[PDB]
Design a protein around this ligand. Structure first.
Ligand SMILES: NC(=O)c1ccc[n+]([C@@H]2O[C@H](COP(=O)([O-])OP(=O)(O)OC[C@H]3O[C@@H](n4cnc5c(N)ncnc54)[C@H](O)[C@@H]3O)[C@@H](O)[C@H]2O)c1
Ligand SMILES: NC(=O)c1ccc[n+]([C@@H]2O[C@H](COP(=O)([O-])OP(=O)(O)OC[C@H]3O[C@@H](n4cnc5c(N)ncnc54)[C@H](O)[C@@H]3O)[C@@H](O)[C@H]2O)c1
Ligand SMILES: NC(=O)c1ccc[n+]([C@@H]2O[C@H](COP(=O)([O-])OP(=O)(O)OC[C@H]3O[C@@H](n4cnc5c(N)ncnc54)[C@H](O)[C@@H]3O)[C@@H](O)[C@H]2O)c1
Ligand SMILES: NC(=O)c1ccc[n+]([C@@H]2O[C@H](COP(=O)([O-])OP(=O)(O)OC[C@H]3O[C@@H](n4cnc5c(N)ncnc54)[C@H](O)[C@@H]3O)[C@@H](O)[C@H]2O)c1
Ligand SMILES: C[C@]12CC[C@@H]3c4ccc(O)cc4CC[C@H]3[C@@H]1CCC2=O
Ligand SMILES: C[C@]12CC[C@@H]3c4ccc(O)cc4CC[C@H]3[C@@H]1CCC2=O
Ligand SMILES: C[C@]12CC[C@@H]3c4ccc(O)cc4CC[C@H]3[C@@H]1CCC2=O
Ligand SMILES: C[C@]12CC[C@@H]3c4ccc(O)cc4CC[C@H]3[C@@H]1CCC2=O
Ligand code: NA
Ligand code: NA
Ligand code: NA
Ligand code: NA
Lengths: 257, 257, 257, 257
């Protein structure tokens, strides 16, 4: 691959799901990729599978993990061109009264402050390389979702933070963009559906939530990330929707009384 | 009513439906209201019913009708403070290949150029009064809709035009805003449902398209218009959604293949 | 005042600035208002000034403060119809590398989790009254701002949270909306400008950031809040911009190389 | 080039500016490209320059031109995979009272109905190929612009139409997306600046309107188009901003009175 050759990319949560799709896409483009993940299973196997990907164990909520991730990346590959903040979690559905402030704070630690912390530690190197930041947010940050107040709020914050940082880093040539996926078929989606009374019905509903009639693939989020890194040189602060059109038109969400 | 007392308001398409709800709201606020409509039936009765509303027959697609509407309004009431461009039409559902360029042009004449023409003729008087313009657009201009390519396009244009005009008229103190209703229960909604194989099913689906579980009322669009005219003095170029939350969250719009 | 008569409203941060403008607007509408604030000076004086407003000392970041705020409101007035989450802070400008994770967390405590906590404690009473929630967010949550990564992120979260909660509470008839002000002339604005090398220049730039050529008033945010509470009965999950058109058109933000 | 090899692309207005950048990008990707333009000068030279691009004279406002364009494309290349509706015009700046209904209609003919007409004639072939439609809209359709009411309205319509058509064509696998460029340095930009009292000042202002401090290049819009055609397989109805961040943050657009 040639479109991002000679570049060094860090993908957090890259061991499975969307993150692994982004890893594969960047390897396919000719980049060297550092797979960051808190769990060893998927990321270790991915390093063995892909020439040009290596795995570094790193919990993005642990600042010393993240510092070591950046310093190890520079020590081993000599530059850093792109950070993809994909690490994140969607808790099982919760009515608002079932949420807690402390659960909210914990989700903010992963989905929001983990992204903030790696970005901060990476920006000195991204400025040297005129690199770029790609945050993986969520369509539900923009349109809301039921039984997910903390999750929706963390993604609203990521999308907004992306624009604020794009403004701060534009004088240095560092672009900052986000991708907002809708329903992408991943192990997280499958686990969440399994908790439901009728998992197959839940999966069927998830497919029909978009006009294309299917969920998206990790590879399709990966292609969007490679575009933003390698070819979107006049794009900064944008929110790239990868949703199959879920946000378009009327649907079933529930005569004038 | 006191909140818009001494003000003179023109509402196009005010003979029935949303337009009549806006007329009643402005009368209730203390304004004098000119009901403009191409059909006599509803608007004539409304003039008889409401002290402080009068009916002027006017087809907004006919420039000489509109010129007479403005000059008659000034001749009879001495000022013009607010123009509500509500006149518009939603054709029966049409697949894209069933549309025509000439039908598209005709819908543009009513939904878009009629609004443009009255606004243009009224702005000299609105500048003298530091008045304001309220365009009735549609939620589907923002999110799209199936089988309505011309309609959606005309409303996308109205919402965009509202922002361009807000920019041009801001130095003169003239605010320009729009309201984007979703499903409002009106005679147009009822007629359109009647064409469907199961009208009651279509009406039931329309109610459940919003999380509030009902369609909106003309009076609720009317309250939003009075707010924009009388109290939104720092609002210009905004799109006020009156939709019951139809744009929020996932719905049925149609595993990763 | 009649438009919200017999209703009971809680406004956080109501001692000064936007919050005090919202308090006055709701009193003017006939509501009883509980002024919540962490500082005594402004809120105590406002209680003495306004018949029908009372002051309750409450730091919204302290859960026991908030519990007492809700229980005292119910004990004293017998119902709760509207909660306005206005309490919030905009730190002095900070480049991203000057921010800290712990400062970010602290700003999240005030701007985001304080709003979450009062909303949660109030919703059982809002469900009984078919009341509503109004969150005061910020235009910069939607469009970003330079040197304000934590602030922008907290407001992106508030706006997103508003839509998620609107979805959860719609089956109970509880509407949840937000207002996104732009530049409103308040003591916070004046303090922030005073830190600048040329405060008058900074204030002049703030006025010209919107096409209307002035900043907004607290009373204008207050009118928008009363509209959402009392008359926007088909509005839920909306973001009402009160910005003077700052988001419209091109401006100075910094030939094809 | 390999990423869109074996595909056949029609680009309207492809003789110069953004359109020519899109032509070059698709040729570079391995596609065969039909350059459609109303003027011969640029498009004829481009056909001679690029193996795999051919020029067909076609005014998109003339329905018989467009029918011949589609039938000639099929006759010569055997399939049609992507239509890029780029043809469009930005009139010199006009205050609203300087616009006319008939000038508005004429601009609608080019910017809106030309796009509608080619799309309609091409969709039977796009359905056979599971092809896609890319409309070139404008950032000012979304945020407005001063002294451009007709132009802004036509682009608001294109962006909205894109979502409506995405909904209609999703069951057939045909994606419909748009690109919204901001300031791209083109012959149209240069001509418009030349009309200004100080062209260099106008160009300088155009560069500083985005946080990246420069205008965009046609090649950068071209890269975004190739991404949408070849790799955005789960994107439909999206508006891809190619603006350098012009829509982000506050700027100069013109204390609380
Ligand atoms: N799947 C969807 O439909 C969907 C939709 C919108 C947004 N998203 C977002 O996409 C991203 C990826 O989601 P997914 O579906 O691939 O989920 P996933 O659970 O399948 O994979 C997430 C990966 O991140 C890792 N991770 C979690 N916490 C971490 C931590 N503290 N440090 C490092 N790595 C950590 C996990 O171990 C896992 O390998 C998330 O940010 C999610 O919010 C997903
Ligand atoms: N009803 C909804 O759910 C809905 C949703 C979104 C937007 N809207 C918009 O709201 C507006 C009003 O719609 P409605 O549901 O009340 O429709 P309606 O058919 O019930 O009423 C429209 C009124 O406008 C009049 N009118 C039509 N053409 C006219 C012309 N050329 N000149 C003057 N008057 C003319 C009609 O005679 C009628 O009195 C329209 O612009 C429509 O697009 C409606
Ligand atoms: N002023 C603007 O231009 C502007 C723009 C956009 C959004 N906003 C938002 O509007 C809201 C009000 O801002 P303002 O300009 O009136 O600011 P302000 O500083 O003038 O007033 C805020 C009030 O909230 C109180 N408060 C702060 N922390 C609190 C806590 N922990 N518990 C209880 N009360 C607390 C303060 O004591 C003060 O009385 C904030 O949420 C702010 O982010 C303001
Ligand atoms: N340049 C910018 O900053 C900018 C910004 C936003 C959007 N746009 C849009 O991008 C598109 C291209 O603009 P540009 O800057 O390259 O302009 P341009 O004037 O440099 O090129 C437009 C091309 O389209 C052709 N064309 C015009 N009318 C036609 C017709 N009837 N039939 C066929 N071809 C026709 C012209 O002959 C020319 O070759 C337009 O739709 C424009 O609105 C441009
Ligand atoms: C949930 C499954 C899991 C989805 C999911 C999964 C991962 C993610 O990062 C975001 C989302 C948002 C929507 C979620 C669904 C709503 C209804 C349902 O069954
Ligand atoms: C249509 C009924 C009529 C609706 C309507 C009615 C009037 C209007 O100005 C806009 C709309 C948009 C949605 C329309 C429905 C989509 C499906 C259906 O049955
Ligand atoms: C800041 C002043 C204070 C503004 C302010 C004040 C309060 C607030 O809640 C939000 C904002 C956002 C914009 C801020 C300005 C940007 C440049 C400047 O000088
Ligand atoms: C105009 C130059 C030409 C720009 C232009 C050029 C082409 C186009 O398709 C859109 C636009 C929108 C902005 C326009 C500028 C605003 C101020 C100015 O000088
Ligand atoms: Na490897
Ligand atoms: Na009367
Ligand atoms: Na009192
Ligand atoms: Na050639």
């Amino acid at each position: 691959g040639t479109r991002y050759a000679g570049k060094v990319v860090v993908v957090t949560g890259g061991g499975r799901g969307i993150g692994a799709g982004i890893v594969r896409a960047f390897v396919n483009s000719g980049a060297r990729v550092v797979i960051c993940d808190k769990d060893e299973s998927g990321g270790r196997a991915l390093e063995q599978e892909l020439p040009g990907a290596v795995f570094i164990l790193c919990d993005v909520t642990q600042e010393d993990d993240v510092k070591t991730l950046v310093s190890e990346t520079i020590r081993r590959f000599g530059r850093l061109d792109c950070v993809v903040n994909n690490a994140g979690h969607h808790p099982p559905p919760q009515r608002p009264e079932e949420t807690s402030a402390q659960g909210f704070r914990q989700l903010l630690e992963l989905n929001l402050l983990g992204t903030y912390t790696l970005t901060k530690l990476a920006l000195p190197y991204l400025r040297k390389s005129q690199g770029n930041v790609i945050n993986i947010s969520s369509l539900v940050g923009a349109i809301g979702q039921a039984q997910a107040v903390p999750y929706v709020a963390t993604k609203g914050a990521v999308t907004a933070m992306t624009k604020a940082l794009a403004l701060d880093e534009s004088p240095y040539g560092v672009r900052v963009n986000c991708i907002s996926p809708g329903n992408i078929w991943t192990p997280l989606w499958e686990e969440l559906a399994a908790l439901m009374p009728d998992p197959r019905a839940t999966i069927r509903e998830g497919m029909l939530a978009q006009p294309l009639g299917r969920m998206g693939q990790p590879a399709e989020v990966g292609a969007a990330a490679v575009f933003l890194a390698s070819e979107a040189n006049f794009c900064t602060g944008i929110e790239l929707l990868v949703t199959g059109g879920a946000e378009l038109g009327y649907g079933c969400k529930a005569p004038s009384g």
